């Protein structure tokens, strides 16, 4: 029976590939040949938020576009007031090895996780006046790569155990589990409508999930290496990826195939972070070579550089308002670019 | 008023400085090794789904943090980039067991890692007493698994433990030679390997780690001060 099922699998794969080939009657580069360039995007370090004792591994902006939570490997979360550099909170973590952090859309909670295989929800607004752990979500059999809030009640996380799960924070147990990746799930991005989310895995593929149906809708296999970062395009119909291949790819969910590749032969290091601009015309990307590059999402030609970091740029994000870009690095400093 | 928020930020900064004064005084060690080894016994003997396991011990009034990565997947390509900038990696192998080739491959993978090219390795060839018993019994020949042993001869620069069977010395030094050859043939200067023979009953592992870490930070400072 195994041989027959493998035959059927290869038949379906060939059919899918042929359909994608048939739908490729044009290219985004060909279509975008007429639009005017964006010129050169020069940005300068408006702020330098320092105080983390070790490598900064993750950061996330609040929906107010002013407060941002930052996580470091020494076991601290610091909620910064970016407008003034003030530190609102400094939360000591139980586990020093934190690899992700999130800021709830309402701003009431933050989450973090890492090699301890547990996602800890912290309650920022409490009568006692101090940040207190509200829930410790356990059940993953591997380190935690990413975590994003659908709401104050629900959080979706991805772990190195090749699984992604959706949690109900109130009861504290997995509502549903997503499976199918054959490697560590390294990044996770939530659709703007919060009905779908895409996760990249070390198996060099990205999958589109349905948070309520619990099944993958389609899979994308354009990369040749591990996918370290992923972000949705603002319209929600496309998403970009970053990999150890030292290149980015832009996939569209409706076309179900890659649209554009961003790479220069003079770049040889992997990509750690990715995020679009508010309009989506720019595609910032963090690199292991200590600097971040700005890519024109349509022309696909490099349009700038953000070089102010001493070490690896491990994290990066754009305000929902779109006024600024934050970039954390292993230098332990976090900088706001504008 | 915003001045109160500034004062709160200053208080948080003072707390962060008081925490940095503890962060910089602690030496962080990563404990690696296959399940057949005795790394669990080693960590237990440190008498001063959860994932990371941490053990703290003190020797000569310097604090050590020993992290054992218990519950993860078999592959470590990604989560090991976090353990960059640790003082040292404590690699443990069951020298009496042969699984030794898988241990050799694992040590080769750790040594030749992009993110661990400045991290010195402290190698504990654990369960040496079992190897000595195995050699004394002579039930199985190490040569079958490793053909090189048929022509290997113990060196003159050896430091044999008093009261040791010569064949045991040859076997243990050959096994040490495997790992030191792997280390020397692939990297130099940036990081070093410190082989050690040990047994679960031993109580000197803390002293071994302390001495090796002392030398490691000596070399780090020597590089920092442009003396090498």
């Amino acid at each position, epitope marked *: 029976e195994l041989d027959q099922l493998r035959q059927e699998a290869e038949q379906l794969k060939n059919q899918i590939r042929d359909a994608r080939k048939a739908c490729a009657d044009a290219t985004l580069s060909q279509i975008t040949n007429n639009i005017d360039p964006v010129g050169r995007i020069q940005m300068r370090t408006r702020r330098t938020l320092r105080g983390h004792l070790a490598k900064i591994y993750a950061m996330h902006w609040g929906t107010d576009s002013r407060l941002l939570v930052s996580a470091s490997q020494d076991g601290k979360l610091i909620i910064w007031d970016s407008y003034t550099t*003030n530190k609102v909170h400094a939360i000591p973590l139980r586990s020093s090895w934190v690899m992700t952090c999130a800021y709830a859309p309402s701003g009431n909670y933050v989450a973090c996780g890492g090699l301890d295989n547990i996602c800890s929800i912290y309650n920022l607004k409490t*009568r*006692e*006046g101090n940040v207190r752990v509200s829930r410790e979500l356990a059940g993953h059999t591997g380190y935690l790569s990413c975590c994003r809030f659908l709401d104050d009640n629900q959080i979706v996380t991805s772990s190195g155990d090749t699984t992604c799960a959706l949690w109900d924070i109130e009861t504290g147990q997995q509502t549903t589990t997503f499976t199918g990746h054959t490697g560590d799930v390294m990044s996770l991005s939530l659709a703007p409508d919060t009905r779908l989310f895409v996760s990249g895995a070390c198996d060099a593929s990205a999958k589109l999930w349905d948070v309520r149906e619990g099944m993958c809708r389609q899979t994308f296999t354009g990369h040749e290496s591990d996918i370290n970062a992923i972000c949705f395009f603002p319209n929600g119909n496309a998403f970009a990826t970053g990999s150890d291949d030292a290149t980015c790819r832009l996939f569209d969910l409706r076309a179900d195939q890659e649209l554009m590749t961003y790479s220069h032969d003079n770049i040889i290091c992997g990509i750690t972070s990715v995020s679009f601009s508010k309009s989506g015309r720019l595609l910032l990307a963090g690199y292991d070579d200590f600097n971040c590059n700005v890519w024109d999402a349509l022309k696909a030609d490099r349009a700038g550089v953000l070089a102010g970091h001493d070490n690896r740029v491990s994290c990066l994000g754009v305000t929902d308002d779109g006024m600024a870009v934050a970039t954390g690095s292993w230098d332990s400093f976090l900088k706001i670019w504008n | 008023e915003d001045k*109160a928020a500034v*004062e709160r930020s*200053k208080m948080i900064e003072k707390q962060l400085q008081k925490d940095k004064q503890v962060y910089r005084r602690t030496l962080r060690l990563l404990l690696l090794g296959a399940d057949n080894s005795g790394k669990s016994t080693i960590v237990k003997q440190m008498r001063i789904t959860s994932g990371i396991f941490e053990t703290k011990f003190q020797v000569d009034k310097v604090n050590f943090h020993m992290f054992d990565v218990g519950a993860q997947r078999d592959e470590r390509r990604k989560w090991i980039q976090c353990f960059n900038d640790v003082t040292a990696i404590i690699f443990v192998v069951d020298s009496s067991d042969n699984r030794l080739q898988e241990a050799l491959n694992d040590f080769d993978s750790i040594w030749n890692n992009r993110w661990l090219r400045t991290i010195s390795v402290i190698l504990f060839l654990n369960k040496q007493d079992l190897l000595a018993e195995k050699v004394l019994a002579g039930k199985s020949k190490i040569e079958d698994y490793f053909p090189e042993f048929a022509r290997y001869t113990t060196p003159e620069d050896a430091t044999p433990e008093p009261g040791e069977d010569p064949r045991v010395t040859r076997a243990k030094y050959f096994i040490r030679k495997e790992f030191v050859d792997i280390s020397t043939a692939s990297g130099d200067g940036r990081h070093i390997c410190y082989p050690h023979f040990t047994c679960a009953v031993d109580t000197e592992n803390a002293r071994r780690i302390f001495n090796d870490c002392k030398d490691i930070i000596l070399q780090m400072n020597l590089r920092e001060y442009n003396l090498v």
Partner: single-chain antibody
Amino acid sequence: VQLVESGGGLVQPGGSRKLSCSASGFAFSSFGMHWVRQAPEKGLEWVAYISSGSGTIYYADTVKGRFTISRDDPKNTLFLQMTSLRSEDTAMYYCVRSIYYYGSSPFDFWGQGTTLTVSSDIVMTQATSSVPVTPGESVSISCRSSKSLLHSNGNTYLYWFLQRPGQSPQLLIYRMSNLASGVPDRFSGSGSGTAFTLTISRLEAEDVGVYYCMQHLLTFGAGTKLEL
């Protein structure tokens, strides 16, 4: 969360007495504390303030140099020491909790208060002394300020408080638009930066009390007494 004061004994003019506050149920270390007095049958007046960590201390000119405020953070106790009590000092003294950071809601919780019986700054005015009302109808309370409380940061540092008969004041609105925790959505606030209005959409008998407006750019308004 509880703030209970102590003291309030009889004092002859020219005497001295120390009031104390015991804080429990919250992290007293990171809260700035205020002393707010209330003379018999009239409005509130701000007495003193000590920031978290005791880094900043302020007094009203009515008591500057005559009172002294101290906090014993390890024991979660706050003290107000008075050296020379005058007849003017007779008033009920509340202790008010306040934490300052972006988005916080200072002045949120007030203590129980104790009666101490003894034998230029911003001018905040509420012209209306009282307003007859009935349950189910909307009512508006207004106030004026000498300076425009709208700071260059965009925030309008105007606070509203309600004191029910026989209770300590409760925070309604902070910075002119933000409802405090536990306040029903029936209350709302607005202002132009120099004139402000507080509105209750639908009144209930539990809303009867005296409404005070305070600026934090700390003077209190004369108060408005809603009656039914």
